[model samples]
Target: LHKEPATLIKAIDGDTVKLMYKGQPMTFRLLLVDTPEFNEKYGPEASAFTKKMVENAKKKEVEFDKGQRTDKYGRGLAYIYADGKMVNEAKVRQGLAKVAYVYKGNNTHEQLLRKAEAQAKKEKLNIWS
Candidate 1:
C-alpha cells in the first residue's frame, strides 16, 4: 500500500474535510457514510468525532482505498483505514456516521461495513439517535 502524508486543514460540513495531501489541497471523502448535517445527528458532536479521528492521523501512515475516486464536487473517493480498519466505517460503527447509499462498493469490505453500520444502528449509536 502506498501511504501519503497529509495535514487536516479544516472540516467541510460532514462528509468532506479540507486537507493538504502532499501539499495539494484535497477534500477527503469520508468513506462509507453520509453523516448528519451537523444538526440532525450529533451536530457539532459529529464534527468533533471526525476531527478526533483525522487529526490523530497527522503524519500517520493510513491505508487509502479509492472506490468512487471522485464526486460531483471533484473530491477524491476513498475509504480510510487506520490500525487495519476503515476510518469512516469505524465512525459508522461508533454511531458517528451513516452509510452513503449512492456509491456503495462491491468490495469484500462492503458486507463488513454494512454489518458494522447495522450494529451501530441496532445499538442506537451516532446517527441512530
Candidate 2:
C-alpha cells in the first residue's frame, strides 16, 4: 500500500492523532497498538512520547499506511510513519503501548510489531514492569 502524506495537527494520545490529509482534517487511530487511557498509569508518559515524536519529526510530516480505513468512531485506522520511523511500532518497542485489536488476515507488520513488544517485555519496560 502507498503511504498517504499528512501533516500533524495534534497528538491526541499515544495511539490517536489529529491530522490534515489532502487539506482535510481527520482523526486517526494507530493500527495494531493500544495505549493506556489518559487517566491510567503510564498514560501521560505515552502521550508525551507521541507528542515528542511528532513534534521532533524533520518536517512535521507523516505518512499513513491505512488499514480498515475507518473505525466505528469514524477515526482512520493506520500505521503512522514519522520521519521514516513507524510510530505505532516505536510506541510498542518503548512499552508505552501493546499489540492489540487484531483480526485474522488483517495483519500487516504484525511480526515486526510483535517482535518489538517482545523486546519491550524482555526489558521489563513501563507496562511490562
Candidate 3:
C-alpha cells in the first residue's frame, strides 16, 4: 500500500471524508465500505461515528492508502487510517458500514473488512440489526 499522510478537513459522512493531501484539498470515499445516507435509517448515527473518529484523532491527522486513486465522481478511493487504525475497517466492525463497491476487484483490505462485517452481522450491531 502506498501510504500518504493527510490532515482532516471534515467527515462528510460515514463513508465520505474531506482531507488535505499533498498540499491540496481532496475528498475521499472510503474504499470497500458503504454507509447509510443522511436521510436513511441509522444514517446520522453512522455520520456521527465517523465525525467523532476523525475529530478525536491525536493530531487530527490521517493516512491514505490509495486503491483506485479516484472513483467515477473524481473522489479519491482509499483506505483511511486514523490513530494508527484503519477507519474503513473500524466502521464495518462497528456495524455502521458494510463491505461494498468492489469495482474491478480492487480489494486492498477485503479480507479484513469482510471479517469485520461478519462479526458485526453475528452481533447484530447497528445496520446488521
lDDT (10s digit) by residue, model 1, range 29-117: 76567777766648687777766676665443333554555666788666554444556777778887766654534243567778988
**lDDT tens readout by residue for model 3, 12-44:** 888888998878999988888888997999899
Ranking by lDDT: 2, 3, 1
Which of 1 and 2 is ahead in TM-score? 2
Is candidate 1 or 3 superior in lDDT?
3
Worst 10-residue lDDT window for candidate 3 reads: 59-68
lDDT of 3: 0.82
Candidate of highest lDDT: 2
All candidates: TM-score: 0.75, 0.90, 0.90
Worst 10 residues of 2 by lDDT: 59-68
The alpha-carbon lDDT assigned to residue 70 of candidate 3 equals 82
Query: Which whole-number lDDT from 0 to 100 does residue 105 have in model 1?
Result: 46
What is the TM-score (0 to 1) of candidate 1?
0.75
